[PDB]
Design a protein around this ligand. Structure first.
Ligand SMILES: [Zn+2]
Length: 205
RNA sequence: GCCC
RNA sequence: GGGC
């Protein structure tokens, strides 16, 4: 190619991001989960139960055909709802993760591919490797409490089942390991205007 | 339906 | 079996 662009984000936004990420404790238990393929992710979440802090954002898919298919069987995201997303956020957030961080997931193959494709092979991964029943014991309880935190899974998902959300997954997997869900308010690490296009034009031109 |  |  003749295209040579290092970042998707401006330096200003990269600096805001770096500051925001200081809310992450480099040594606290940290869950990570994605929806979409590791080579073409559409939803990313990281969650630290110790503080209630979470990182949550979206990305428009490159493979629209595979996406519409994945939506039917897993995430139920409509692609039009992913238009206002910030390009480059996935790379920027992953680049900003502390060196040699320990990340917990269920399971690890997709997480590993994504992080390694970003040159983070320094990140250590713990796979909880739970069954399909044990990992989703608190599925209803989590959605009951935290549904307002993600409005993106509007499509009917079949195998009809509850849609898979990267954020709800992190919270419910933690609940499974902790043997309970304790009721508490969570805190978004990223500013809203970093995650979505937020401008409202006065007039169309 | 697709991936491991 | 696990995952989208
Ligand atoms: Zn979600």
């Amino acid at each position: 190619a003749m295209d040579h662009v290092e970042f998707g984000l401006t330096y200003s936004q990269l600096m805001t991001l770096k500051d925001a990420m200081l809310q992450l404790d480099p040594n606290a238990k940290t869950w990570m989960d994605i929806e979409g393929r590791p080579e073409d992710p559409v939803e990313i979440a990281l969650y630290q139960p110790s503080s209630g802090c979470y990182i949550h954002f979206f990305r428009e898919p490159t493979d629209l055909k595979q996406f519409k298919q994945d939506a039917k069987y897993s995430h139920g995201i409509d692609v039009t709802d992913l238009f206002a997303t910030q390009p480059g956020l996935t790379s920027a957030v992953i680049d900003a993760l502390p060196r040699n961080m320990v990340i917990t997931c269920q399971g690890s193959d997709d997480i590993r591919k994504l992080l390694e494709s970003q040159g983070r092979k320094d990140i250590k991964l713990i796979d909880i490797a739970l069954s399909k029943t044990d990992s989703r014991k608190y599925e209803n309880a989590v959605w009951d409490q935290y549904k307002d935190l993600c409005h993106m899974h509007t499509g009917v998902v079949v195998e009809e089942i509850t849609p898979h959300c990267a954020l709800m997954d992190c919270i419910m997997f933690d609940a499974a390991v902790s043997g309970g869900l304790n009721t508490s308010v969570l805190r978004a690490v990223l500013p809203r205007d970093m995650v979505f296009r937020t401008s409202t034009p006065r007039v169309v031109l």
